[PDB]
Amino acid sequence: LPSPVVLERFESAQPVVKGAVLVGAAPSSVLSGAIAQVLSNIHTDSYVGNNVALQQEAAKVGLNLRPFNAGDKESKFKAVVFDASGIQNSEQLNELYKFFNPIARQVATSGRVIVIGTTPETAKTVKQAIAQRALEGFIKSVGKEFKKGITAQVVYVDEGAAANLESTLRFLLSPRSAYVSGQVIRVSKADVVDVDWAKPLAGKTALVTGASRGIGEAIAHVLARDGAHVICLDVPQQQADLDRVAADIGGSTLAIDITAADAGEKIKAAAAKQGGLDIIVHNAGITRDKTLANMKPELWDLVININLSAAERVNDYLLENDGLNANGRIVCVSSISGIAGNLGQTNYAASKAGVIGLVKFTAPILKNGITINAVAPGFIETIREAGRRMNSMQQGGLPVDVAETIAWFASTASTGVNGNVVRVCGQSLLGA
Amino acid sequence: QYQAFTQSPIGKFVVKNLGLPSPVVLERFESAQPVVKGAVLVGAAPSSVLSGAIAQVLSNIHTDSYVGNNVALQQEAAKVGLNLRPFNAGDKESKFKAVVFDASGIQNSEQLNELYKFFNPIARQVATSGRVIVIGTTPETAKTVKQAIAQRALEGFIKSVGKEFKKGITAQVVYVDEGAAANLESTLRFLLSPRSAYVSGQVIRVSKADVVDVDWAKPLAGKTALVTGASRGIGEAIAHVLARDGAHVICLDVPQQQADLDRVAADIGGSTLAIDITAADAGEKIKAAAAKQGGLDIIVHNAGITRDKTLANMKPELWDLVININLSAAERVNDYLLENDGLNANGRIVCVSSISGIAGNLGQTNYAASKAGVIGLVKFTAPILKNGITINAVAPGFIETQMTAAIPFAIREAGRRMNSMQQGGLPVDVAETIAWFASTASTGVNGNVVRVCGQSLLGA
């Protein structure tokens, strides 16, 4: 067996993409102007084949699209981006072949395959809905086949929501998404909001539960790296570690039990002096693994309470009592076990499938531009021989990989990212 | 080779998730009666709303049914004519072939412990080849957000039970749309029965529709079915089960397969149609072939091919052929039948996807695209169907066929081991699931994609 490729991860705000991007599009596509504008914004060398319509879209936004000689098998591209919105029926799925077959060996190590389509439920015809649905099978197979640490994603843009794609395209193009692969992201219509892309949380106040250690600590570091003032929450027994984490990020502490009845009240009170809470990350979670036959009742109850019920109560309080600011963010943490189940985890998997429902059925009732999304981490370094290699990256992920994905959800610019559950698993074999 | 696989990281991955291989010989269908061999234990959360419909099914199938100290459940079952015998909660010895729980009364996450209350005491008393069945309210139809969330959580529970209980036991969640309880029966019978032997870990949605009369012993009696790819393999097995259930089966396959088609049709009292399903006139010829038998009721799109190649090495025609046979040809035929009076009322379209359409696979960019498209064909055709017609798909996992010996060792070994049954499935397992969709009674089963995979570890 080979040992795993070393993945490229975030080093600095610029460049967003180190290396060249190759763009393609199907005939009659509608997202190419929005894609070209992002590539212009991030000042990357961008290339295109013999597609006049796509060349015209980049001209309209001032993107110098360097033509890519189709006889060139030697050049390497850090990302390949395909607008599939123009695929109108199953026979036009060969537009995927026409773009990706000629360059399938020219994606760089730690590269990116990104297919951008139209959300199948928003497609105007059944034939297009079917074709757009098929894109997920294609990208998941690419994710397993291309190797070299390359990730593969489909971004579905709701019909008419091209203006809302930028923060998602930026995340996927960048090394920040190093451990996100095989996934489906849905972009919906929302107001566009000004942002400093170098500090996309500047001026915001975030709260991270379970912040004193582990992934919660990593979350707090990335939110502070993006410009946020982070309130680090954990139980008073963890005050020393809370103080350590807060001192490392210029943050503050809130030492309470998130399951207490008054937790939402105290969270709102804590953020009042900063001008209110913008971002809450429900990272607090526990496992109490036991076969159901051996499991004690309180170990069922505790896992449901901390992992699910507690976040419900806090969300209910904040949303009903002006506890989150406009354009605010709720980010939850599910798990692959919540999607796929796991032996000894009837309690944990129930709780984390609950978290998926919390995201999916809260998202439609949010107002004031608030969004709710979740990450579903796979094998992250902190069954262990099992998890580690059983993914397209052939390695476990790092806490920063989960934190980067949470920070993309929390970005001031991700107004149109809502109701998503995105696995952070390097395309783990496991699933539903 | 086998010891090396076990010692390898994927072999250790299997053992950490499923334990060491202890597969069971799975019970499969033998006769229409009894539906369930053995006793059934029924339970319900407080304030549940599906227990009268569940009890009516258990009364219809004449199974020995038991209940704990749930007075409301006992009273509702008695009202609809079901005798529920008390199950002494101190009895760790009795075995149940099926345990059925009405979870519709779970109104929020704190009430998820009703799952623990019912299932923890009997977690070692489910029989070999038994059934765990949780029946809830479809989350998208729940009246409150809190209940939607709690009903969504049921899937994580049942998927974990499916991996934990072992012994060939399957675990399912059936979601019943609010108001659709009378449409549950064919699904509950399928899951209670050995017919569903290789279906586990799955989510089935029951929606509101007319309740139609049926002979449960011959649930396709009087109907005409067409099976594509019928001359061998899974298509042959589908044809056998549809005939077993009472249908006249038209077996369709390419003219080069005429000998095998003739052999299969004579084995089931059916007929043949020797055409290429991709032909522009395949829809016309299908309708013509059923015309002299009262028209076509059921079509099973089982024809399918692989042309496995990395995308870099794949030729254009090997992309095109896979999309055409596996996806575009079924679209054309459905479009023709649905627009030109080619399917009878209460008709059935059943498609075949694949785990690779859900999970992706190296060397299958073409095949996985085509089979993900099949999921879209089901999901986006279902809402526009009229006249009681339904469309569903099976998504088979690793099935033992005559083609399995051609699969390279490591892919085949992972296929056999990486599922909760710790074994590959049989073609009849796929056929039974298709037959349940095709049932004259399955009127409120529409738009479902159900994996037939023994709860394979793979997925999305």
Numbering used by the authors:
A (entry chain B): 23 to 404, 414 to 463
B (entry chain A): 4 to 463
Q: What text comes from the article?
A:
Finally, we report a HMwFabG (ABO12488.2) in A. baumannii, with a dimeric structure, preference to NADH, and similarities to MtFabG4. After successful expression and purification of the recombinant protein, crystallography trials yielded two crystal forms with different space groups. The structure from the second crystal form was resolved to a resolution of 1.65 Å, modelled in the P 1 21 1 space group, had overall Rwork = 0.2 and Rfree = 0.24, (and was designated crystal form 2 or CF2). For CF2, N-terminal residues could be built in chain A and show a bent helix structure (residues 4–22), unlike MtFabG4 where this region was truncated (1–16) to assist with protein solubility during expression and purification. Chain B of CF2 had regions of flexibility and poor electron density between residues 1–22 and 405–413 where it could not be built. Each protomer has two domains; an N-terminal domain: β2-β3-β1-β4-β5-β6-β7 and C-terminal domain: β14-β13-β12-β11-β8-β9-β10. The N-terminal domain displays a flavodoxin-like fold important for dimeric chain interaction and orientation as previously described. In terms of quaternary structure, both models complemented elution traces from gel filtration suggesting HMwFabG is a dimer in solution with protomers an approximate size of ≈ 48 kDa, also confirmed by SDS-PAGE. Overall, the general structures of HMwFabG proteins are conserved, and the catalytic C-terminal domain closely resembles the machinery used by classical low molecular weight FabG enzymes. Within the C-terminal domain of HMwFabG is the Ser357-Tyr370-Lys374 catalytic triad and Asn329 creates a kink in the α10 helix important for proton replenishment and this domain closely resembles the structure of a classic 3-oxoacyl-ACP reductase, including our FabG. Preference for NADH coenzyme is determined by Asp256 which is suggested to decrease available volume of the 2′phosphate accommodating region, thereby providing an unfavourable binding environment for the larger NADP(H) coenzyme.
In contrast, bacteria utilise the FASII system which involves a series of discrete and functionally specific enzymes that produce fatty acids primarily destined for incorporation into membrane lipids. FabG (3-oxoacyl-ACP or β-ketoacyl-ACP reductase) converts β-ketoacyl-ACP to β-hydroxyacyl-ACP in the presence of NADH or NADPH. FabG enzymes belong to the vast superfamily of SDRs that play a broad number of biological roles in eukaryotes, prokaryotes, and archaea, typically sharing 15–30% sequence identity and ‘fingerprint’ motifs. We provide high quality crystal structures for three enzymes: a functional low molecular weight FabG, a putative FabG protein, AbSDR, and a HMwFabG.
